[PDB]
Design a protein around this ligand. Structure first.
Ligand code: FAD
Ligand code: FAD
Lengths: 577, 577, 52, 104
């Protein structure tokens, strides 16, 4: 590889790929490094659930997720095992064992927080929900002019939506989807609006949805190539980026220090522009390892010279979950238009409807599907077709219900008792709360303990803030209980519950954006440029300084697009040599 | 896609790749089809645990295994859920729900049996244990001549071991490995021999082992290419192979019918030679779907015209498992050569040994690793280095202990309480029993129920035979209990247990080999040619007609080599034109 | 059940099991304090936990 | 069939039952506190040998019931505690509290 590029990007997630798409397409010589490896097939960084096998065995996909989520900070284990044989060796203390972090207070953790080190990052497994933030959740891009701010965000979001292939039409003809959507529309008539969850996905067939990923944004193929003979891009997997080298004046980055994990070689890579898109945790780690912020346990009797807000004001959403089993009323309603003659399994069994009849509660397309299912499978007790797609329903965040909602199905590990319930009956409920940014909520890095890549060990100091965040979180639980009851009762084993803190993986504000470093307690400006530094940019959810309930990736992507606009105005591509 | 090849191979697992390696190398124009897709990175069909991330987070790999093991036959679920809300819909029967197979007697199943549909098949996730069979477990290749039979096996197994890169040296300087190996060697001195498990793997560094796979055997890259300009090979993923067409005479296969899963189109592909290497279950399924054997519930009153032994005499191994926590005596013995002065953590702490001392129990390389760990990590209570590789110990099958043994570590999901025990103390015990072939033990296929690819649904009728099989299985359990106690007591949560039937994934005899179709109740001859058919060969564990405890893949590969020798002597490659 | 109902544990060490799925509105201590009749004198690793 | 095998434990001075001077129990009496490990040596070896013996002997009658696999029970669950106020001939020589008449 060259030592010299126009642009170096750390991380090949969807945010890294947004930079790569914009900057490769504008004629810059780009190198992208990822600590992880290529493993999504021939489409590099593509979504792992787009195999025929996973489209046919959806729930096995939960194993793929779990197998690439590595816990950020695990406290020292203090569980007593006192049924060992007297001959087995035992320590007399709960010593530092099994990669546990002794810095971590088990009672101020984000235990569910995890990271993914693969090409394409978490976009190789994500759920693909890409709602816009409303003003209340949304960082400001233009101060003191709400229309100009709105217009800029619409522009940026529309482009981000095009990059991700966001749509709200991919489940429109699902019986289960419409059964739920219609019931909730009616129950909340004049109070709340429901729609399809906006999803980064393209339907290919009645039983195949091609979910979007990093690969959708940028195909990650080295360039030049036949499709792009004038473009310049190299991806380097299995390279750990360890630090950016600051000049003495703290005005410029001078190089990127990398460790090739295959060869073991270390290099200094040189570029005009350095972009860190390693995720909310690992962007922060890289910066602290580079001398930004402060290494070790926070010391307010000793704040840092550089980026003193780095790794403070961290936010993570509250998440509540249950599953429901569809009501008898709703199930019976699916076949409301049918005239049912005979008894099932006999020659005299008839299931019929009058197309177009004005007393019909359902459209013809619905009734035809139900009729055909009922006539072709007379042993089956349910009127819902076997291949009917899942529900994908939301009522988006509003001031009177300040949480995002997903009323849907994703990959799930059902227990053997739960497998006793026909999957057509089951609906997942996920409500997401917004968390107030507070200075005392921190991600910091040990000056003694290291992680598996020999980098300073991440440590959380986090609690959900008292006041509005907590009140809202409990209100949100209640809301899920109230709403879900309109659809069916809870599925035993998936009763209403808060998820382990950080399991939701929507961490924000670790390297947060604002107008003024001091006044807005922030690390990057609205171009995502690190304050003081001409040529260092951060991308990702870590830039988001607001309290948000909606899924953050689309918003992070929108910010990266704006960042790229600045970069294009301020840095000249090298002549193609 | 051409319409004609010299050879068509169904399946890209290690056995398919053995035929590809042999026959592509011999100059044949070869096509290979797999129902699954490329998803191991740039090295097509390679081992998924060869990522730096999985070498650093080894236990997360159980998720990869689970994510690609799809259950063969799941009986109807009869578990009662009686805590639904009264409003939730419920059927009044345990109806056919959630992909269950209503043909399947839950009491005569191999419930742990599963299949993997990905390029490279199960060799993308396997444990890589490749022992040879001794005579007692081994099918005959030469009748009435023991020394000729021995010579032929040695030749074949030696070539197979080169293809897989089998070795017994990759763990030779592990402390844990030698600690266990030495203790068991001493305990069974004069009674049994211990060695390293033969493993298809190449050590690349102290902390990285490159596990073998189908990619090791054959790299699966289309040819001709720069490295093999005169070879011809094409791989076609996402193609469901559905049947081989028999001529009227049942003497020749005339084409392979395929279903392209991406386009949805069906085609007939022509070849001179047709090789089925789709695994023990799916080879049998493709054959039954093609008019061999009998569709539906087996019926002695109406025996099949072709291959009446197909899907009878099936074998699966008994498997017993536990984990142990290393004894205090063994742990203390690790540092038996050290002189320890002072108090850990302080100035004067000193751990020293005398290199070459005739009174040393351990070699200098061992003592040096122990000394450095103890001096560099004075807070750690154990003498075993943090990066010390796992044990990989076996006493191979013998008449006096007719089971295979693995005393080792592989990827495992530890509970929170088990996570309390330092990983360096833990050893896995897996003992594998041999199962007598019995006519009444069957894999058959429904004439009404279909699987996820619309093929006849596999159904088991299996019990571990009475007599020797069952007595040995219980003796094997006791043997594990006795031998394991020499190393340490059982780990709570991983107490000695029989595993679910077929979880072991060593199914054989489904399309079994023998000399005479009728006399030996078999389906293929010793060249793996289907009786009566000039040009149809089967490869895999399904060929193995014996009762074996050792892991069968190396043996199945050895049979495939011998098959390829036949093909090379009886079929002429097309001119490279 | 009769047996279990009249066996009262002799010495229960302080419980250090993390419950982190409480609602944010629920009261939580910042430490594993002496709770529910536990014995802060008891080393959990040198106990007869089953003694009753 | 249930299998229960009971090991013997060497009396060791370091294995103690003591009482808190600060914590009290539900009857306001000094709180009992254990300081106990199974002694190294014979006690531990025999305990593990006992485990194996149970595994070998039980196999003659049948295989293990799933959910009741061979296991050590939590220390003291057996409820056969002894030696807390132990007998001997001579208080000092036999390290004891009562004589053979059970007299303090
Ligand atoms: C896991 C998950 C995530 C998820 C979700 C459901 C699951 C189970 N559902 C989502 C939803 O429906 N909508 C939403 O908006 N997001 C959802 N997510 C989260 C989403 O995947 C992430 O927000 C998004 O992927 C973040 O993108 P970003 O590009 O910022 O970060 P990343 O994907 O984590 O990629 C970071 C990469 O950089 C690498 N890396 C890390 N450290 C280094 C170093 N030191 N050097 C070089 N590279 C590094 C990684 O390996 C990685 O690929
Ligand atoms: C899963 C596993 C396997 C395993 C192991 C541990 C686990 C968790 N440990 C083993 C060990 O230590 N030693 C050993 O000998 N075996 C071990 N195994 C088993 C081993 O993986 C298998 O025995 C081996 O892979 C068998 O090879 P074979 O090439 O015969 O079959 P395969 O790997 O299953 O691949 C078959 C393929 O064919 C495809 N397929 C199936 N049906 C079709 C149709 N209709 N059309 C086209 N292709 C088809 C598959 O998708 C597959 O890739």
């Amino acid at each position: 590889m060259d030592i010299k590029y126009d642009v170096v990007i750390v991380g090949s997630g969807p945010i890294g790929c947004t930079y790569a798409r914009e900057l490769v397409g504008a004629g810059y010589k780009v190198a992208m490094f990822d600590i992880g490896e290529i493993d999504s097939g021939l489409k590099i960084g593509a979504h792992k659930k787009n195999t025929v096998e996973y489209q046919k065995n959806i729930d096995k996909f939960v194993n793929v997720i779990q197998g690439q989520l590595m816990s950020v900070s695990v406290p020292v284990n203090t569980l007593v095992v006192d049924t060992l044989s007297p001959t087995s060796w035992q320590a007399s203390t709960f010593f530092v064992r099994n990669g546990s972090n002794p810095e971590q207070d088990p009672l101020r953790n984000l235990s569910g927080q995890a990271v993914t080190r693969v090409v394409g990052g978490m976009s190789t497994h994500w759920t693909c929900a890409t709602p816009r933030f409303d003003r209340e959740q949304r960082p400001l891009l233009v101060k003191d002019d709400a229309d100009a701010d709105d217009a800029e965000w619409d522009r940026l979001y529309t482009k981000a939506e095009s990059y991700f292939q966001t749509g709200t039409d991919q489940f429109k003809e699902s019986i289960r989807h419409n059964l739920v959507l219609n019931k909730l529309t009616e129950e909340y008539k004049g109070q709340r609006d429901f729609q399809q969850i906006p999803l980064a996905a393209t339907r290919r067939s009645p039983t195949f949805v091609e979910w979007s990923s990093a690969n959708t944004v940028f195909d990650l193929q080295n360039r030049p190539n036949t499709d792009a003979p004038e473009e310049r891009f190299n991806l380097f997997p299995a390279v750990a980026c360890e630090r950016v080298v600051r000049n003495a004046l703290n005005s410029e980055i001078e190089s990127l220090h990398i460790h090739d994990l295959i060869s073991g070689d270390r290099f200094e890579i040189k570029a005009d522009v350095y972009v860190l898109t390693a995720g909310a945790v690992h962007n922060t780690q890289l910066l602290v390892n580079s001398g930004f912020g402060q290494l070790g346990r926070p010391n307010p009797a000793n704040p840092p010279e550089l980026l003193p807000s780095l790794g403070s004001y961290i936010t993570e959403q509250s998440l509540v979950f249950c599953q429901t089993v569809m009501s008898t009323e709703l199930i019976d309603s699916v076949k409301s238009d049918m005239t049912i003659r005979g008894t099932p399994g006999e020659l005299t069994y008839s299931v019929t409807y009058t197309p177009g009849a004005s007393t019909n509660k359902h459209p013809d397309w619905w009734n035809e599907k139900v009729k055909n299912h009922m006539m072709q499978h007379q042993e089956d007790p349910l009127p819902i077709p076997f291949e009917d797609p899942e529900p994908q329903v939301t009522t988006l965040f509003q001031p009177s219900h300040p949480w995002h909602t997903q009323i849907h199905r994703d990959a799930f590990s059902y227990g053997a008792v739960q497998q006793s319930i026909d999957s057509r009956l089951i609906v997942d409920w996920r409500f997401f709360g917004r968390t107030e940014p507070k200075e005392e909520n921190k991600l910091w890095f040990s000056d003694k303990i290291t992680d598996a890549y020999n980098m300073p060990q991440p440590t959380f100091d986090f609690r959900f803030p008292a006041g509005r965040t907590s009140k809202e979180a409990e209100d949100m639980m209640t809301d899920m209980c109230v709403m879900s009851a309109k659809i069916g009762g809870f599925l035993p084993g998936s009763l209403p519950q808060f998820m382990e803190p950080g399991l939701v993986l929507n961490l924000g504000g670790t390297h947060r954006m604002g107008f003024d470093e001091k006044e807005d307690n922030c690390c990057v400006n609205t171009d995502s440029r690190v304050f003081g530094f001409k040529n260092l940019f951060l991308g990702g959810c870590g830039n988001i300084p607001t309290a948000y309930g909606a899924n953050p990736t689309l918003t992070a992507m929108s910010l990266a697009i704006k960042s790229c606009e600045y970069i294009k105005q301020n840095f000249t591509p090298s002549p193609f040599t």
